[PDB]
Amino acid sequence: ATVLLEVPFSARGDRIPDAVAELRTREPIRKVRTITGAEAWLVSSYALCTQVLEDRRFSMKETAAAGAPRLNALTVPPEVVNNMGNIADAGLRKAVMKAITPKAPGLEQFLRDTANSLLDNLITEGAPADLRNDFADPLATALHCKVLGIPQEDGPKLFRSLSIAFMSSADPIPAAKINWDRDIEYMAGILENPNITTGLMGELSRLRKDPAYSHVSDELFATIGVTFFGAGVISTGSFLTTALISLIQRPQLRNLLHEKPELIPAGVEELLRINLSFADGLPRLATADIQVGDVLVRKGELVLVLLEGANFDPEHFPNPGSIELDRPNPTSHLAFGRGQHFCPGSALGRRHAQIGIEALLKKMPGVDLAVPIDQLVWRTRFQRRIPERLPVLW
Numbered sequence: 001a002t003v004l005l006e007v008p009f010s011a012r013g014d015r016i017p018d019a020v021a022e023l024r025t026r027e028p029i030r031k032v033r034t035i036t037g038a039e040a041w042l043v044s045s046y047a048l049c050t051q052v053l054e055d056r057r058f059s060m061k062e063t064a065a066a067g068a069p070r071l072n073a074l075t076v077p078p079e080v081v082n083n084m085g086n087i088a089d090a091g092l093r094k095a096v097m098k099a100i101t102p103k104a105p106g107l108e109q110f111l112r113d114t115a116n117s118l119l120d121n122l123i124t125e126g127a128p129a130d131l132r133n134d135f136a137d138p139l140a141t142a143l144h145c146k147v148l149g150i151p152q153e154d155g156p157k158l159f160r161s162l163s164i165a166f167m168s169s170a171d172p173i174p175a176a177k178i179n180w181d182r183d184i185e186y187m188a189g190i191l192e193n194p195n196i197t198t199g200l201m202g203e204l205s206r207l208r209k210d211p212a213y214s215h216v217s218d219e220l221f222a223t224i225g226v227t228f229f230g231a232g233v234i235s236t237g238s239f240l241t242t243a244l245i246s247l248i249q250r251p252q253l254r255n256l257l258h259e260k261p262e263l264i265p266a267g268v269e270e271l272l273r274i275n276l277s278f279a280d281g282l283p284r285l286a287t288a289d290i291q292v293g294d295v296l297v298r299k300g301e302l303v304l305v306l307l308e309g310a311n312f313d314p315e316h317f318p319n320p321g322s323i324e325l326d327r328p329n330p331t332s333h334l335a336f337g338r339g340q341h342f343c344p345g346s347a348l349g350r351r352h353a354q355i356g357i358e359a360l361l362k363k364m365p366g367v368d369l370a371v372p373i374d375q376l377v378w379r380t381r382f383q384r385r386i387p388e389r390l391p392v393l394w
Ligand code: HEM
Pocket: 060, 083, 084, 100, 227, 228, 229, 231, 232, 233, 235, 236, 239, 282, 283, 334, 335, 336, 337, 338, 340, 341, 342, 343, 344, 345, 346, 348, 349, 350
């Protein structure tokens, strides 16, 4: 006799566990136990994952209710789980959307210059180089400093919170509140800084003084900057890191994109589809009794949407483990979510990876792992799957 199935199955981000395909075929919605001891429904087929994400009766906001079954402990104040809803209710949705588009002036040129500059420094240091710590994460940090309008020099200060902020823990984390309060104070001070006139924070600083927004709290302005820095940097840094592994593992594809850089957008979209950067299913709480497949999910129960369950579903993406640049439904993957909470930084995340991969293949076309792939150290109890170091030669 053995306990219920425990999630997550594996912290490894370079291969999908064989357990996923067996669940999807036999039990596409199945009861599991989370690290807090709570029971939850895990949803692993394309059809059921999309149904859950498009039905607003499965609520993100309500996962923060006291006494709800939990996937993990909150590392933010409970109101911040409703971050996007708080933004829209204060009338700030359009303003935030336009600050994070990759079409901001000089932003693509900044991304390319910063990428090339990071790679030159790696080249002059000599091999081996760490493509996570000395390329992907700094490129992500620099990009979000620029998007936010804050000094590049403050990037590493704010990045320091992220190894704790995005932890996937069974219990509350004392350090997370310390860093949160300190980071909120930093962004509050940015709003009072007359030199901050560009980017998201520059725009928020001027809306703050506009009569149409005089009843929006200073707390919310500062929260927008912390949350968008944190979610954007950890999501873009982690995706680009694990996308470089899938590329290194496929030298034919690596060579094709080097000779034909026009295929990089199509390649990045497949790298998004097969990416394993999210370490847990997306949590939602049922606010009603709702039929999902063969199971009646009851009000108050937790449902977990497994992104790789949908994205590797052979009924929607035939030969799902293969990168194919000519699929007829290329953007229909769930790497950015779906429905109400679709990622607002999808365009920016796509552009970060395209420019990073393009710069890498032009400077480092023979890039390869400097250690056997089994030697990578995968971070555990974290909301993203990432190797601690990514040593490469070229
Ligand atoms: C490759 C990069 C990225 C990936 C794979 C990614 C993935 C995702 C996914 C799957 C969700 C939905 C979560 C859910 O429904 O529970 C989401 C939401 C979100 N993302 Fe992204 N994201 C990326 C980049 C970004 C960037 C660049 C930003 C901002 C600078 C950002 C900010 C947000 C925010 C604030 C939400 C919450 C949206 C809401 O609650 O309505 N993300 N992301």
